[PDB]
Design an enzyme around this catalytic site. Structure first.
Site, mmCIF file in Angstrom:
data_model
loop_
_atom_site.group_PDB
_atom_site.id
_atom_site.type_symbol
_atom_site.label_atom_id
_atom_site.label_comp_id
_atom_site.label_asym_id
_atom_site.label_seq_id
_atom_site.Cartn_x
_atom_site.Cartn_y
_atom_site.Cartn_z
ATOM 1 N N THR A 125 -4.689 4.221 3.201
ATOM 2 C CA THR A 125 -4.676 3.035 2.325
ATOM 3 C C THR A 125 -6.008 2.838 1.565
ATOM 4 O O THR A 125 -7.089 2.851 2.169
ATOM 5 C CB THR A 125 -4.453 1.823 3.209
ATOM 6 N N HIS A 181 -14.364 8.427 -1.082
ATOM 7 C CA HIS A 181 -13.232 8.755 -1.951
ATOM 8 C C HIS A 181 -13.301 7.793 -3.163
ATOM 9 O O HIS A 181 -13.747 6.682 -3.026
ATOM 10 C CB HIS A 181 -11.935 8.587 -1.168
HETATM 11 C C1 LIG Z 1 -7.357 8.237 0.338
HETATM 12 C C2 LIG Z 1 -6.736 9.050 -0.571
HETATM 13 O O1 LIG Z 1 -7.172 10.157 -0.899
HETATM 14 C C3 LIG Z 1 -5.473 8.586 -1.225
HETATM 15 C C4 LIG Z 1 -4.918 7.348 -0.897
HETATM 16 N N1 LIG Z 1 -3.787 6.948 -1.505
HETATM 17 C C5 LIG Z 1 -3.153 5.755 -1.201
HETATM 18 O O2 LIG Z 1 -2.284 5.740 -0.039
HETATM 19 C C6 LIG Z 1 -1.472 4.557 -0.132
HETATM 20 C C7 LIG Z 1 0.016 4.931 -0.146
HETATM 21 O O3 LIG Z 1 0.403 5.816 -1.202
HETATM 22 P P1 LIG Z 1 1.949 6.015 -1.525
HETATM 23 O O4 LIG Z 1 2.016 6.742 -2.829
HETATM 24 O O5 LIG Z 1 2.683 6.499 -0.278
HETATM 25 O O6 LIG Z 1 2.341 4.463 -1.791
HETATM 26 P P2 LIG Z 1 3.822 3.791 -1.607
HETATM 27 O O7 LIG Z 1 3.714 2.438 -2.252
HETATM 28 O O8 LIG Z 1 4.934 4.724 -2.040
HETATM 29 O O9 LIG Z 1 3.823 3.588 0.000
HETATM 30 C C8 LIG Z 1 3.243 2.507 0.710
HETATM 31 C C9 LIG Z 1 4.302 1.942 1.677
HETATM 32 O O10 LIG Z 1 3.740 1.025 2.631
HETATM 33 C C10 LIG Z 1 4.687 -0.013 2.923
HETATM 34 N N2 LIG Z 1 4.067 -1.156 3.642
HETATM 35 C C11 LIG Z 1 3.487 -2.293 3.151
HETATM 36 N N3 LIG Z 1 3.030 -3.044 4.177
HETATM 37 C C12 LIG Z 1 3.345 -2.391 5.315
HETATM 38 C C13 LIG Z 1 3.142 -2.646 6.684
HETATM 39 N N4 LIG Z 1 2.507 -3.791 7.088
HETATM 40 N N5 LIG Z 1 3.579 -1.755 7.599
HETATM 41 C C14 LIG Z 1 4.206 -0.625 7.222
HETATM 42 N N6 LIG Z 1 4.453 -0.354 5.933
HETATM 43 C C15 LIG Z 1 4.016 -1.210 4.965
HETATM 44 C C16 LIG Z 1 5.270 -0.285 1.563
HETATM 45 O O11 LIG Z 1 6.497 -0.902 1.803
HETATM 46 C C17 LIG Z 1 5.399 1.162 1.002
HETATM 47 O O12 LIG Z 1 6.640 1.831 1.305
HETATM 48 C C18 LIG Z 1 -1.956 3.733 -1.351
HETATM 49 O O13 LIG Z 1 -2.670 2.553 -0.925
HETATM 50 C C19 LIG Z 1 -3.035 4.595 -1.897
HETATM 51 O O14 LIG Z 1 -3.761 4.144 -2.918
HETATM 52 C C20 LIG Z 1 -3.133 7.752 -2.397
HETATM 53 C C21 LIG Z 1 -3.630 8.993 -2.733
HETATM 54 C C22 LIG Z 1 -4.828 9.422 -2.142
#
Ligand SMILES: CC(=O)C1=CN([C@@H]2O[C@H](COP(=O)(O)OP(=O)(O)OC[C@H]3O[C@@H](n4cnc5c(N)ncnc54)[C@H](O)[C@@H]3O)[C@@H](O)C2O)C=CC1
Ligand SMILES: CC(=O)C1=CN([C@@H]2O[C@H](COP(=O)(O)OP(=O)(O)OC[C@H]3O[C@@H](n4cnc5c(N)ncnc54)[C@H](O)[C@@H]3O)[C@@H](O)C2O)C=CC1
Ligand SMILES: CC(=O)C1=CN([C@@H]2O[C@H](COP(=O)(O)OP(=O)(O)OC[C@H]3O[C@@H](n4cnc5c(N)ncnc54)[C@H](O)[C@@H]3O)[C@@H](O)[C@H]2O)C=CC1
Ligand SMILES: CC(=O)C1=CN([C@@H]2O[C@H](COP(=O)(O)OP(=O)(O)OC[C@H]3O[C@@H](n4cnc5c(N)ncnc54)[C@H](O)[C@@H]3O)[C@@H](O)[C@H]2O)C=CC1
Lengths: 318, 315, 315, 316
Positions: A125, A181
């Site tokens: 995150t 990062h």
């Molecule tokens: C550190 C690093 O290099 C990177 C980090 N990220 C990130 O990793 C995170 C997730 O990326 P993704 O593309 O998987 O985002 P998404 O919106 O498809 O997935 C996030 C999921 O979390 C759920 N969510 C929200 N609150 C939650 C909780 N309390 N418990 C479980 N799931 C939850 C939400 O419903 C969604 O499906 C984002 O915050 C980023 O910015 C992305 C690329 C690189």
């Protein structure tokens, strides 16, 4: 004996690819946890079928309950953000989301503390160097059992872009990117090798210019943006980097991997997480390795941590 | 595919491991060729059953006929020999045998020219940096299509020993060993890295000392003797090294691998094969990379090539 | 467990390939144990270097001390005689190995009981269906924690030879060979499939005849002999079969694999080990599957166990 | 030697996982092609970085040009239409997709004919057994060079659900589902084995009941709806299945795989593609295997084909 349990807290774009790669590699049972109803269950069902094609045997289940963290060997946290009705369809940002994601880390942390205090935790995150420390604080796990994604992914771009200019195997380029990062990541030109040979030898040979290298440096820094502008936040390579870190732990491989870790004087910084090479083995972080940075390099690192401290101070901002 | 055809010219200890690994990796049909009758057929039959356990589908046959070189994509030559009759192990070395082995390379070489002129060739028969030029001369293959085993195997020992002292993944150590395979091998201390980081930094941090690094250098040079004195011979690591080279070609991976290739003015040297980083891709040797050695290192390279020129001018 | 420990009690031909395959698959730290001094240490040194080529991190050490059993997750027993000391090839009698390998099983068994009573044990030493029961008795391990090599290796030949006739992937042929490893192995024609399809369909379509199938049966029974006549020795496929079993345990895959296991009533037999399909998961033998054999199949199984009982009686 | 070139015509959900798996397996260079601008270039750049983690060397590029079909060894077609406009609100129709997907096949097929007539082609676009034939017809490729996805995916469900009831490795269950992909798929109880052993033995040993097998059969047929109802059309397992088929070709493995192929009298059917076990090797379809079905099985197979024929007849 007896099959590792890996819980993906967050089953969105990154979570999906992680579950897929876990089954491919036969690494452990997977729980796809999300706050979104039905979605993880649907992805887990689809993904569970691929065990046949892969000659694997990993259970893949979907969950909306934190109870399913019980017994986890590895917990990977990609949970965050969100968005609301406003205020669209691009209104999201950054600075505002710091209190929001701090509060998700507290909620997750209390559940880890109670249900899987011996898990190895990987935080994803954003901003990761802030969020990992927040989870560390609220989960109570030892400092050697929690790390953040950054260097493995950031260096993969730099490694990749150089290998294509030089026409070698991508993993035959080695590079270190440290500090954080994000936009202040520290690209260390000095520490780039190609088949174990300093990059400066290929520059002396006019195989690649200094202008071409700086082109690649800016492309590396700006890669997330470049992909977002073609598509969306990248997710295939981040998943691969996270699985490479989790596998090093689960198989005790002791790979040197650049990740975010609690700094305890390294680089002159304390009470903060930042990106540095470390060794991941069966006990967690086994070694934190401090690069011997020159003055100019340390100034860049200082800027990266300063930015992490800046954002960390905004978790209660209004 | 058509499935690649890999001919093992020599089906001894190393040939055996290579056939096994080719099947594990599903890399191509295997011909186990040897001068010894029935033996390669017997090994081939055993090996072929491991396709089931491996979920692979590689034909593995044995042969005593050079005609089976026909249509080979890759030819690996370990045909020799391995030690000296009348000679023991506490003296383990290599001698004479140079003209008998030249006569092997002449005979193999003619057959390559005739039946598989377009093959990628890897030479393993010792002295390797000599034997490879010989097969090069007699087979008539292009210079980008024949290399000798050395640096992948030699650097593996150095990488391995350093990784165990520093408690990291063996492949996270990178190292270059150049010049020639054998006692003259140039161990380049300055070109060692750990997780991409200069070895000197771990020396500075006192995780390893300059005297442990010299002990490990010594151990690398003398590894083959160490194994032989222990009543074994090295064949598992040499086979894995060769298959890494062979696979880089067959899958067009373009790995940087230190191998013995024709020097054409590199290192101030010509008309000789020397060990140097190169890129193995689907067209063979795609790049020969010339290290920017300092004079202290160029002296050590000069000497390794000296010993190779000494054994060649002699057959 | 982060890094499993796998102890190879016997570091001869099969032990060598096993250690090689464990490093390839990064399956665990390996102890190559033997009574012969220095040899397993030489082999272990060679094999350790291949960690580099394989991008693995498995310690491989040689040992002549049974203390290395402590901490073992998996113990693979190949230790034993292959012929009686003093005897010629002509006076070869299989029954002669019975008291000689029995003594070895007694020695190993006491050490397992003391040092690694919770290890998963795989017995390879011939005659395996006897030796495995002997080690079970002397080690005192639970019945779900010890098995013998047999059906994985035997069906691999049958599978392979059928696949070569029908021109399909070898693993796409399924077959069961039960009762015992050796000349009395029960080849179950009724249970052969090709891509999940009864083999009868392919006979009906004239893709293969009943006589070809019979000749393949003969070939399968007589494979070790065929290979020995060719001046080799089945060890590559035996090694692969054993690692497939050990891996199904270490990774809790729950593969269905035919191995020698304690019969407690299955097939009408008790107090004896015999080959039958079984499930290998993280806890050992998770299920023993009794095949619903018909009258004629059953009497073939009786004759196989009868022969195991006969050799056991000798002890 | 040199590197295979694999063109993904369609860079949607299934497209993305395919490109990921190709890189994991170092199978070849990948072109992610789509009609949607920029999207496949973004996915390709992201996917290309994973070469480092995978120790692979596959170029991954994105394209909005059909020119990139030139030099393809393997073309995988997932390109299509779906969704619907105005309609309110659960009555999406149908079926009305058939002519729009046919027009996509006509377009793709003309470029394959021009630019890569020797490619091996795997069609995924639904209804697959109709679309593969249309693409076969518009592309001009030999009949041994084009197949449709169905049975590898459909049997993975049935294999998997049985393995979980019996507590064995999923791939240790074998099963044959034939005729067509879709609601009329023919699930052959008689051809189910577990570690090589007839399913009936497990039924006799009371490890699974006849009723459980039937509920599993119904779950197998309802699986796409189950997942659509929760999420969307399935994509991970479909991609894995397609890469298994593509890999058997590229590495000449000669696996027996149930896929949609041109029927030439098998099962009493001609001028139509249907699901059947077949062998995929370096030359394409090397064998078509006809199962010796009973009368009842043969009649379910007829009902599957008749529905393929039915939809094909809606194409003008
Ligand atoms: C550190 C690093 O290099 C990177 C980090 N990220 C990130 O990793 C995170 C997730 O990326 P993704 O593309 O998987 O985002 P998404 O919106 O498809 O997935 C996030 C999921 O979390 C759920 N969510 C929200 N609150 C939650 C909780 N309390 N418990 C479980 N799931 C939850 C939400 O419903 C969604 O499906 C984002 O915050 C980023 O910015 C992305 C690329 C690189
Ligand atoms: C370059 C390098 O790092 C290393 C090279 N080697 C060597 O590679 C060679 C093979 O070693 P291996 O352990 O395989 O030796 P082996 O004696 O078990 O097998 C050699 C086989 O070649 C056959 N052979 C002899 N003449 C032949 C011919 N004309 N054609 C085909 N095979 C022939 C002979 O019958 C034997 O089986 C020896 O010359 C080496 O010194 C070994 C380790 C490392
Ligand atoms: C069950 C089955 O399908 C098969 C079984 N075998 C056999 O497996 C065994 C090993 O075969 P391998 O070809 O590896 O024999 P080898 O002589 O090369 O190795 C045997 C090793 O055992 C050592 N050994 C002897 N006594 C020992 C002891 N007391 N403790 C430890 N090691 C011992 C001995 O020194 C040699 O290195 C023999 O009993 C077989 O008949 C072979 C093929 C298939
Ligand atoms: C046969 C079989 O078992 C299965 C078939 N399918 C289907 O496979 C197809 C694609 O599934 P996916 O989940 O990938 O759908 P998507 O909408 O995410 O991707 C379709 C892509 O095709 C593009 N597209 C449309 N026209 C195109 C054209 N002319 N050229 C290239 N791409 C095109 C469109 O932009 C989208 O990205 C759908 O028709 C299916 O019904 C799905 C699961 C199983």
């Amino acid at each position: 004996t007896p099959k590792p349990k890996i819980v993906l807290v967050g089953s969105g774009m990154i979570g999906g690819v992680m579950a897929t790669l876990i089954v491919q590699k036969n690494l452990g049972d997977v729980v796809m946890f999300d706050v979104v109803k039905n979605m993880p269950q649907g992805k887990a069902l689809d993904t569970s079928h691929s065990n046949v094609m892969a000659y694997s045997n990993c259970k893949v289940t979907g969950s909306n309950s934190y109870d399913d963290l019980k017994g986890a060997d590895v917990v990977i946290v990609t949970a965050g953000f969100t968005k609301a009705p406003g205020k669209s369809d691009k209104e999201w940002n950054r600075d505002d989301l710091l209190p929001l994601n701090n509060k998700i880390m507290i909620e997750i942390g209390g559940h880890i503390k109670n249900l899987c205090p011996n898990a190895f935790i990987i935080v994803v995150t954003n901003p990761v160097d802030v969020m990992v420390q927040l989870l560390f604080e609220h989960s109570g796990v030892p400092k050697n059992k929690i790390i953040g994604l950054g260097g493995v992914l950031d260096t993969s771009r730099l490694k990749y872009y150089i290998s294509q200019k030089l026409n070698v195997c991508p993993r035959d380029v080695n590079a270190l990117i440290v500090g954080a990062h994000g936009n202040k990541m520290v690209l260390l030109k000095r520490y780039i090798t190609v088949g174990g040979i300093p990059l400066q030898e290929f520059i002396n040979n006019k195989k690649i210019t200094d202008e071409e290298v700086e082109g690649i440096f800016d492309r590396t820094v700006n890669t997330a943006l470049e992909i977002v502008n073609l598509l969306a936040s990248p997710y295939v390579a981040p998943a691969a980097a996270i699985i490479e870190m989790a596998e090093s732990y689960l198989k005790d491989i002791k790979k040197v991997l650049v990740c975010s870790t609690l700094l305890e004087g390294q680089y002159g910084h304390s009470n903060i997480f930042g990106g540095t090479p470390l060794v991941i083995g069966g006990t967690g972080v086994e070694q934190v390795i401090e690069l011997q940075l020159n003055a100019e390099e340390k100034t860049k690192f200082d800027e990266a941590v300063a930015e992490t401290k800046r954002m960390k101070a905004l978790i209660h901002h209004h």
